[PDB]
Swiss-Prot record:
Belongs to the UBE3C family. Autoubiquitinated; promoting its own degradation. It is linked to Neurodevelopmental disorder with absent speech and movement and behavioral abnormalities: An autosomal recessive disorder characterized by global developmental delay apparent in infancy, severely impaired intellectual development, absent speech, and aggressive behavior. The chain holds residues 693 to 1078 of 1083 of the full protein. Highly expressed in skeletal muscle. Detected at much lower levels in kidney and pancreas. The gene is UBE3C. It comes from Homo sapiens. The active site is at 271 (glycyl thioester intermediate). Changing residue 181 to A/E: Reduced E3 ubiquitin-protein ligase activity. This is Ubiquitin-protein ligase E3C. E3 ubiquitin-protein ligase that specifically catalyzes 'Lys-29'- and 'Lys-48'-linked polyubiquitin chains. Accepts ubiquitin from the E2 ubiquitin-conjugating enzyme UBE2D1 in the form of a thioester and then directly transfers the ubiquitin to targeted substrates. Associates with the proteasome and promotes elongation of ubiquitin chains on substrates bound to the 26S proteasome. Residues 48-298 form the HECT domain. Interacts with 26S proteasomes. Interacts (via the HECT domain) with UBE2D1 and, less efficiently, with UBE2L3.
Amino acid sequence: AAVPFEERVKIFQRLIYADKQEVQDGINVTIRRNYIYEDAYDKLSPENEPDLKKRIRVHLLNAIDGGGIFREFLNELLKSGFNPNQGFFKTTNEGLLYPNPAAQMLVGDSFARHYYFLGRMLGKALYENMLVELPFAGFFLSKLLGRLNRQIRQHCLAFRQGLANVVSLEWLRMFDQQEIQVLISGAQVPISLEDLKSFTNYSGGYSADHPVIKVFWRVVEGFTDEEKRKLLKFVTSCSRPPLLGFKELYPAFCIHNGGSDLERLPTASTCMNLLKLPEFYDETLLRSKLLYAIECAA
């Protein structure tokens, strides 16, 4: 309407900022990666942790910065919790997520306890400014904002209440359903290399004018829009940029100096939006290795 999307997202983020500083005494939990959803559902229950705006720090057992260990936990948890195989969400013709009407039939009576949990985890994703590849059906998003769309109404009530434990629904009612989808999984726009280059961080000896970096940007300047999408997904785990551009990617997209070992491949740490790039001084070398690293990630 009157005010455009961008200015509203700046309000959204300013509200979360003041909120985040009101509540300074964190949350410490231990999660088995092989048992991620079952452990989180227990460890971060409403009875164990009623205030989820607090800062969570995770010991992931597999059996990294801490803020990164957390983002890695939250991303794999959201991927696991929202997978149709867990029984709480299914997909339309296009792969759009929405609450499973058979959840009680298939999960039993605690089914609403799980929708409250997923809403909390989605709210923490929004609260901690982390995009995630969750494509939701719009009718589900609008039911959160405020006929056979009533068979999932206990589902949406519990989900909505979990969301409201972390991000206030009044903040969210600033937004369209489409705009909400963009707040979750990013803007459906082409990737701007000028914007990305403007807010790229360098580490391990690299900088905007290091020769390897200069080769890098010459390589990715020749990438199709599809390959820029794949590169971004490879580094951040999301294939779309934040609405407000890469200035508002947390952590900043970062290119870090790998070895001089030219047998290693570029590797990524998506929980840090980090690309570990060996010191490739030749374009064909960099281009083939980088695309190969991206394809093997599929």
